[PDB]
């Protein structure tokens, strides 16, 4: 991911789409892509807040991730055009918004991150 | 000291990390998973479905692989990956600092 959420004047909806799924236009994605990307984003946020956090509780982390995994298994089982699946997507997008952290840790291996371009590499030319 | 003569970039081998070590660590991480049954059957040419990794278990395994290898993998690259061979190739050729 380019990790450019806070740059290029993204609106809140666009930033939420980028966080939940790798793309800014989730409609292009199919059912499996949507479900897998949302599950990955939810797991990443839960790991950030309940493993690499302030006095994190690993037992609570395990319970939360297990519940999330069960819910996402049910979501994947559900059909794309289902109000229950829509409710699950809304629930987990709301969870992502709730856990959204300004100045959240951005790995140095991603573009647009701090220290991303500190050095200019000279070409063979 | 660098010689006064012109020296060009030396791309020794596309891998920035020992590919064998990367593959072995990734295979160990995959075997750690509950769904995976037979570690022996896992090979670089073995697909995720045949080794037993479900689409949902794949994202968990990839997140833990990111944690283990100290890198972040884009969803596009993770979806493009089709075999352990491709996964290990991408991880080994990846520059850990981008």
């Amino acid at each position: 991911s380019k990790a450019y959420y806070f740059v290029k004047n993204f609106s809140w909806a666009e930033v939420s789409n980028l966080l939940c799924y790798g793309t800014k236009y989730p409609t292009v994605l199919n059912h499996q892509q949507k479900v897998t990307r949302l599950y990955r984003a939810t797991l990443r946020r839960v790991y950030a807040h309940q493993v690499e956090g302030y006095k994190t509780d690993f037992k609570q982390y395990n319970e939360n991730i297990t519940d999330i995994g069960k819910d996402f298994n049910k979501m994947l089982a559900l059909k794309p055009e289902s109000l229950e699946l829509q409710a699950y997507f809304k629930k987990y997008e709301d969870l992502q918004e709730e856990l959204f952290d300004p100045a959240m840790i951005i790995d140095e291996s991603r573009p647009y991150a701090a220290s991303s371009g500190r050095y200019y590499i000279f070409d063979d030319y | 000291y660098a010689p006064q003569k012109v020296v060009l970039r030396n791309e020794k081998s596309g891998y920035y990390a020992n590919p064998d070590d990367v593959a072995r660590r990734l295979i160990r991480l995959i075997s750690l998973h509950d769904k995976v049954q037979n570690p022996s059957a896992i090979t670089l040419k073995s697909t995720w479905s045949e080794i037993g990794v479900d689409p949902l278990s794949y994202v968990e395994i990839m997140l833990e692989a990111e944690n283990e290898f100290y890198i972040e993998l884009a969803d596009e690259d993770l979806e493009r990956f089709r075999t352990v061979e491709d996964a290990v190739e991408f991880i080994a050729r990846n520059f850990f600092t981008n």
Binding site: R118, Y119, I121, F122 | A2, V7, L8, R9, T97
Partner: peptide, 8 residues
């Protein structure tokens, strides 16, 4: 610690 050296 520091960045990897590259040709100049």
């Amino acid at each position: 610690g520091g960045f990897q050296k590259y040709p100049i």
